[PDB]
Amino acid sequence: MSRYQHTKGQIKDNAIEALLHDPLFRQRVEKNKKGKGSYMRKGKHG
RNA sequence: GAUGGGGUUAGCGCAAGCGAAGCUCUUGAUCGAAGCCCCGGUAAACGGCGGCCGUAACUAUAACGGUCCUAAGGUAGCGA
Numbered sequence: 298m299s300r301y302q303h304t305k306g307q308i309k310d311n312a313i314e315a316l317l318h319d320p321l322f323r324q325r326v327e328k329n330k331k332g333k334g335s336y337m338r339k340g341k342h343g
Numbered sequence: 344g345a346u347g348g349g350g351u352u353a354g355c356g357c358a359a360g361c362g363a364a365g366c367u368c369u370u371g372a373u374c375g376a377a378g379c380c381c382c383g384g385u386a387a388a389c390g391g392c393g394g395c396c397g398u399a400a401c402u403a404u405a406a407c408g409g410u411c412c413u414a415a416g417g418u419a420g421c422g423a
């Protein structure tokens with residue numbers, strides 16, 4: 298178990314909130330397999 | 344000195360009184376400039392150069408916004 302090194306510096310008011318506005322809890326959006334962000338130049342096995 | 348208002352009195356009414364001309368006391372139409380008000384300009388003229396409330400990826404701050412006021416809200420630079 299290693300410590301996550303957050304980008305908030307010195308947390309003052311609330312830790313969880315701070316974390317939430319951090320890269321660790323950034324939004325993740327998946328790449329489309331079909332649809333908009335869907336075009337693949339080369340396959341996984343291409 | 345325009346007009347008005349008085350004072351005096353030649354004269355007239357059987358009389359309270361009225362009262363010419365003059366002189367005279369007063370009122371002050373009209374005329375009448377600059378100034379002042381007025382309309383602009385001028386700050387290396389004298390001078391003056393704002394508040395309150397909110398707002399961002401913990402927190403804090405607030406580039407941002409709201410509103411009131413002003414002739415205008417302090418620029419560059421500097422700053423216990």
Ligand SMILES: [Mg+2]
Nearest residue numbers: 376377378379
């Ligand atoms: Mg004049």
Ligand SMILES: [Mg+2]
Nearest residue numbers: 384385386388
């Ligand atoms: Mg000027």
Ligand SMILES: [Mg+2]
Nearest residue numbers: 417418419420
């Ligand atoms: Mg300054």
Ligand SMILES: [Mg+2]
Nearest residue numbers: 420421422423
């Ligand atoms: Mg000191």
